[PDB]
Amino acid sequence: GTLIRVTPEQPTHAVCVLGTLTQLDICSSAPETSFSINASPGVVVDITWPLDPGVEVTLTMKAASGSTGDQKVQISYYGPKTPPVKALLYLTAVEISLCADITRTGKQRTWTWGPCGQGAILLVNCDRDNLESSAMDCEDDEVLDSEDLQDMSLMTLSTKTPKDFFTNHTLVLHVARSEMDKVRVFQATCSVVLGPKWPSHYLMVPGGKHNMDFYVEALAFPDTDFPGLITLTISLLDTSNLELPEAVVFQDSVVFRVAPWIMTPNTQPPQEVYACSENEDFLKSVTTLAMKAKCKLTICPEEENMDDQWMQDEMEIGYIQAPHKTLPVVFDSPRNRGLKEFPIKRVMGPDFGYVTRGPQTGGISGLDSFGNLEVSPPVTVRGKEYPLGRILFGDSCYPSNDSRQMHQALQDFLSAQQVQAPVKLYSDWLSVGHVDEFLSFVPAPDRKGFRLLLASPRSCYKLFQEQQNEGHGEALLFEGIKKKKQQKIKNILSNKTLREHNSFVERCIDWNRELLKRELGLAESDIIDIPQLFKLKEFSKAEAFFPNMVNMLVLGKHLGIPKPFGPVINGRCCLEEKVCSLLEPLGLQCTFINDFFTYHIRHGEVHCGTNVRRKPFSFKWWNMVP
C-alpha cells in the first residue's frame, strides 16, 4: 500500500512497483470544491468529482516505464469562479519480483500446508557431495561442486526498470538476524550473499530487464527453537538524496519451509541392508535374504565395528524431500558405541545426508538406541490422516528414579518434524528396553495393507498346551543346541514362576496393544500375535526366553526371523510352524536364522543386528495438514 500526496505548489515524483496498490491524497494540499483527473494512457485511475476526503483515487500501471517519470498524472482543482489549478505527478513504473517454487512443482504472504497450500521448500544441505571433505556441504560458505546446487532451492529476482533506474535506487536482499544462522544464499552468474555472518547484501543490478538467480540451502532442521520457516526479503531503496538516509520504497518476501527428516516403516520397499562382520552363517542368511529382496548389501567389518554388532542401534535411515530433490539422510544416535563412526565415515556421503542429536560424551540411556525408534505404516485415526505413519518410541509409564527414557533432545527433534506425530509406547519393562523387542509391522495384501505383529506369551502357552494335549509333553525346547539346558513342554507349562513372569509381560504388552489401538486406529483384525515367552532377570526386567521372533528383518515379503529352536513335533519346530501358519496366508516368506550363539545370548536378535534403507513415501509431506 502507498499514499502519494499531491500538491499544486510543486510537482511530485513517485515510483510505482507493478502489483502494488497506489492511492492518491488529493485533498490534504488542495487549494481554495471540485477536482478532475487526467492521466497518460499507461495509467489507469479508478475513482467531474467533488473534493471529499473520503472518496478514494487509485492508480495502477500496466507496464514498466522506459524512462523516469514517463507516465503523468494531472489533477485539476476547480470551483464556481476559479480557473482550474493543476497538480502534476510524474510516475515511474517498475517490475520487482522475487520468485520461488511456491506451488511446489519444481517450476499469499505465508507458508501453508496441504494440496491447496502455498510456500517453497528448502532442504537442509547435510549431505557430502565434496571429494575427501569430512563435513556436510553446508558447514562452509561455498558451492564447491556443481552437483551441490541440486540440493539447493532456486530463487529469482526479476526486474524491469529504466536503464538509469539504479542510479537513484538500490536493492537489498535480507534475512532477519533471527534466522541468518539457519540459511545460506548464493548468487549465480557463484558466491554467498546471505548467511550466518551476513543478514543483508546490496545487489548490483543493471537497469532494463534483468534476471538474477540465487541458490538457497538450509543449515538447520526444524527443532524446539526453530519452527522451520525462513523468510527472505528484497527491499527497494531510494538513494536519490546524497545527504539523506536510504528510504524503503517497496518490500517483498518469499517464505521457505525447511524439509523435515522422515522415517520409513517396514512396509516401504527395501533398497539396502546393513550388518556387521563371528557370525558367518548369520551373514550368509541375510545375504541371501537381501538377494531375494533385490537389495544392495553393505557390511561393517571388525576393524570399524570395534566389536559392535548392533547395527540397528547407532542409526536410523530416513529421508528429506523437496519437489526438486529427495535424499536419504541418516539419523545418527548419540549412543556412540563401537559403530560410532559408521554413519559419519561411509553412510554419510554423495546424496546421503547426516544429522545427529543429543549429548555426545555421555548422558545417554539404552532407550536412545534406535532399536527403540520405529514408525507405523500410514494410518488414519478417527478421521485424522497420518499418511507417512507415526513415529513410535519406547518410554516408561511414569518417571521414577529407576525409569529410563530416550533423551529429550531426540524426542523434541522427532516432534518438531511434525509430519509423523510421535507416539510414546511403554518399553522400559524390557531389560534392553526397545519397542522392536515386542512389535514389528509387515506388509499384507488386504485391509490396511499391513499387520502389526506383537510378541504374545498367551499364544505360546496356547501352542504348548495344545501340543501336550496331543501327547507331546516330553517335547524339548532347545533341541539343536549342544550347550544349553533343554526343557520339556510339561515342565515349561508347570513352572509357576515362569507363568507369573509371562503374566506380567503380557500385561505390559497388552497396555501397548491398546495404546497402539487408540493412537494408530487399529482393530484386532489388524493384529497378529507371535508365540513368545519371556523371563524376568535383573531388576525384574524382561528378556526373551527363546530367540525373540518378532524382532525380525522385513524385506518386502521376505522375512528374516530368529530361529526359536522350539519343540520338534512331526519333524518341525512347532513355533516355526505356528509363525508360518500365521504369516504365509498374507503371502510372506519366513526364513528362520540361527542367531543364537552370537546375537540371542547377548540380548538381541536379527532386527537388532541389521538396518534397512527403504523407499521414501510418494505422498509429499507438505500436502499433509499436521
Ligand X SMILES: *CC(=N)NCCC[C@H](NC(=O)c1ccccc1)C(N)=O
Q: Which residues does the annotation mark as catalytic?
A: 313, 434, 436, 608
141 annotated as belonging to a binding site for a ligand: no
Burial tier of 241 (Cβ tally within 10 Å: 0-12, 13-18, 19+): exposed
User: Which partner in its own copies, Ca ion, ligand X, none is near 351 (CB below 5 to 8 A by kind)?
Assistant: Ca ion
Give min distance, CB of 606 to ligand X, in A: 9
Q: Considering only residues 353-372, where is the footprint of ligand X by CB under 6 A? A: 369, 371
Stretch that binds its own copies, among 175-183, 211-219, 364-372, 544-552 (CB under 8 A): 175-183
- Of the pair 345, 602, the CB lying nearest ligand X is at 602
Helix axes 574-583, 457-469, angle to 10 degrees: 120
Q: Whose Cβ is closer to ligand X: residue 467's or residue 548's?
A: 548
Determine the length of the chain: 626
Task: Find the part of the chain contacting its own copies (CB under 8 A) among 302-310, 360-368, 483-491, 512-520.
Answer: 512-520
For residue 603, the partner it binds in its own copies, Ca ion, ligand X, none, with Cβ less than 5 to 8 A by kind, is ligand X
Among Ca ion, ligand X, its own copies, none, residue 373 binds (CB under 5-8 Å by kind):
Ca ion
Would you say 332 is a known binding-site residue? yes
Nearer to Ca ion, 437 or 519 (CB): 437
Size of the site for its own copies (CB under 8 A): 53
3-state SS assignment for residue 149: helix
Least distance between ligand X and beta carbon 61 (Å) = 40
Q: How big, in percent rounded to 5, are the helix, strand and coil portions of the chain? A: 20, 35, 45
Rounded to 5 degrees, what angle do the CA atoms 326, 329, 334 make? 165
* Binding interface with Ca ion (CB under 5 A): 125, 127, 129, 137, 140, 142, 148, 151, 332, 336, 351, 370, 373
Contact with ligand X (CB under 6 A) among 217, 428, 436, 576: 436
Count of CA atoms in the C-beta half-sphere (13 A) of 537: 8
How many other C-beta atoms lie within 10 A of the C-beta of residue 86? Answer: 12
Q: What angle do CA 514, 265, 347 make, to 5 degrees?
A: 140
CA–CA separation, 54 vs 449, rounded Å?
Answer: 64
Q: Does 145 appear as a known binding residue?
A: no
Q: Is 600 in the site for ligand X (CB under 6 A)?
A: no
DSSP string, 511-529: HHHHHHHHHHT--GGGEEE
With CB under 6 A, what is the number of residues at the site for ligand X?
A: 15
Instruction: Give the long-range contacts of residues 410-416, CB within 8 A, separation 24 or more.
Output: 410/333, 410/334, 410/357, 410/358, 410/368, 412/223, 412/224, 413/221, 413/223, 413/224, 413/261, 413/357, 414/373, 416/221, 416/222, 416/223, 416/224, 416/226, 416/227, 416/228, 416/260
Q: For cell 536412545, what's the residue? A: 368
Neighbours of 542 (CB within 10 A): 24
What is the Cα gyration radius of the chain?
34
Which residue lies nearer to Ca ion by CB, 502 or 548?
Answer: 548
Minimal CB distance residue for ligand X? 371
One character per residue 529-568, x = contact with ligand X (rule: CB under 6 A): ----------------------x-----------------
Residue 303 vs residues 276, 314, 348: alpha-carbon distances, Å: 10, 17, 19
Tell me if 538 contacts its own copies by CB under 8 A. no
Is 142 marked as a binding-site residue?
A: yes
Give the whole-angstrom CA distance, residue 299 versus residue 311: 9
Interacting span for its own copies (CB under 8 A) from 174-182, 287-295, 356-364, 483-491: 174-182
- Is position 333 annotated in a ligand binding site? yes
- DSSP for residue 346: I
In the set 48, 189, 400, 570, which binds its own copies (CB under 8 A)? 400
CB of 102 or CB of 544, closer to ligand X: 544
Residue type, 458: R
When binding is defined by CB under 6 A, the residue of 261, 310, 331, 438 that contacts ligand X is 310
Residue 5 interacting with its own copies (CB under 8 A):
yes
Q: C-alpha distances in angstroms, 236 versus 15, 253, 255?
A: 10, 12, 18
User: Which residues bind to ligand X, rule: CB under 6 A?
Assistant: 310, 312-313, 369, 371, 432, 434, 436-437, 551, 602-605, 608
User: Which residues bind to its own copies, rule: CB under 8 A?
Assistant: 1-3, 5, 28-29, 53-54, 172, 174, 176-178, 199-200, 224-225, 233, 235, 241, 243-245, 247-248, 251, 397-400, 405, 408, 411, 426, 429, 458, 462, 497, 500-501, 504, 507-508, 510-511, 513-514, 517-518, 524-525, 536, 540
